[PDB]
Each structure stands twice: as structure tokens, then as C-alpha cells.
Amino acid sequence: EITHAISSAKEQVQEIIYKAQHNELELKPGMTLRESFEGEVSRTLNDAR
């Protein structure tokens, strides 16, 4: 179960990365595209752990 959850989160992070690289990420108020990407990835990995 633990390894499945970690793999699912790695796939989620890879999807966020694909969306950011093909210019499809949704920015946030008071926040840059790169800061939005980093915040979303950090959220995903914290929830994975």
C-alpha cells in the first residue's frame, strides 16, 4: 500500500511537470508560474508522505 501511494504521487508530480512544460498550469494570485509549480509539487509530496 505504501509503495503504491508513493508511486501514485510520483505519477501525479510527473503530470504536474508535463502540464508546466507544455504550458498548461494554472497560476495562483500573488504567485509566479514557477512558484505555483513548486507549491503544487510540494503539496503533492507532503500529502504522499
Partner: protein, 111 residues
């Protein structure tokens, strides 16, 4: 793009031929005054993109650290290309990539 002097080898500055109302270019050292081609005299930019594709050399294929992708080359249908993101270093720049083929050395993109 400002030129330089054909005689004094300094740089030519703008001036006005008030008796013909045509933009000359005046040497601040010599008396030489040539005809110009472009009536534009100044420029200023804030949305720039210089440094988009400039970050490529002939032997960039020899870099062993660049990650290699399976994207099809639009030119020669080559199934092996090294790739990298925009070499511009600003904070708000994209994360869109550039793709260099190892066969024709033509750069391409996934768009």
C-alpha cells in the same frame, strides 16, 4: 544597429539636414556625413526573447549530460534527439522545451 565611420573609425550619431529635412548621421570627430537607410532612431524593449534558440552549438550533440528524447525529428524522421528548456534565465520564462536533432543538427520544437 548603429554604424561606424568610414574615415575616422568612430561611431556616427543622428542629425538633421535642416535644409532638406532628411535624417543624416553626423561624425562628432570629422566632417563626414553619409546617407542613411532607416529613419528609426531609438528602441526600448521589456518583453524580449533574445536568448531563446541562441543556446546551441554545432557540437552540442557531444554534450553527454543533455537528456535524450524519443521525439520525431520533423526534418529527417530521426528517433533520437537531445533536448533542453529555454536558455533565457528570467523568473517568468516558460518551461517549454527546445529539441535538437543529432542527424541534421536542425533545432525543432514540440508544438
Amino acid at each position: 544597429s548603429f554604424r561606424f565611420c568610414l574615415e575616422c573609425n568612430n561611431m556616427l550619431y543622428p542629425k538633421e539636414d535642416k535644409e532638406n529635412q532628411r535624417l543624416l548621421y553626423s561624425c562628432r570627430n570629422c566632417d563626414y556625413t553619409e546617407l542613411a537607410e532607416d529613419p528609426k532612431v531609438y528602441r526600448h524593449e521589456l518583453i524580449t526573447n533574445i536568448g531563446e534558440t541562441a543556446g546551441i552549438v554545432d557540437d552540442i550533440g557531444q554534450d553527454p549530460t543533455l537528456p535524450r528524447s524519443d521525439k520525431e525529428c520533423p526534418e529527417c524522421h530521426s528517433r533520437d534527439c537531445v533536448f533542453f528548456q529555454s536558455q533565457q534565465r528570467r523568473k517568468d520564462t516558460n518551461m517549454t522545451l527546445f529539441y535538437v536533432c543529432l542527424n541534421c543538427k536542425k533545432t525543432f520544437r514540440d508544438e
